[PDB]
């Protein structure tokens, strides 16, 4: 199978800044990758398909890029509603694989 891993499993961030989450595949998946956002009481929500494509309803501050085996999700001017756990997924080959997840938390004193 293809193994997806994300750099950190967690980031402490500030409202308003740029947040980046990169995922790296154990093999080349060629832009066949999706990003999901999940909050504590519901199903994951699709943000990205095909590495760079925004899904309908997804705020434009979200974007993704990368190639081969290295991809990244970027969120500009982070909003409070954006604080959640984010996952990558590869669908280049079965079984389908998800990254372990990166949880955003807000930093404070």
């Amino acid at each position: 199978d293809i193994v997806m891993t994300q750099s950190p499993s967690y980031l402490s961030v500030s409202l308003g800044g740029r947040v980046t989450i990169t995922c790296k595949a154990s093999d080349h998946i060629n832009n066949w990758l999706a990003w999901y956002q999940q909050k504590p009481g519901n199903a994951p929500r699709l943000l990205i398909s095909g590495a760079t494509s925004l899904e309908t309803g997804v705020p434009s501050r979200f974007s993704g890029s990368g190639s081969g085996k290295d991809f990244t999700l970027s969120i500009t001017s982070l909003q409070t509603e954006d604080v959640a756990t984010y996952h990558c997924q590869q669908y280049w080959s079965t079984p389908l694989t998800f990254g372990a997840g990166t949880k955003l938390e807000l930093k404070r004193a």
Binding site: H28, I29, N30, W32, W92, S93
Partner: peptide, 8 residues
């Protein structure tokens, strides 16, 4: 034999 990428 299963493909991949485009031939997936």
């Amino acid at each position: 034999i299963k493909g991949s990428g485009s031939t997936a």
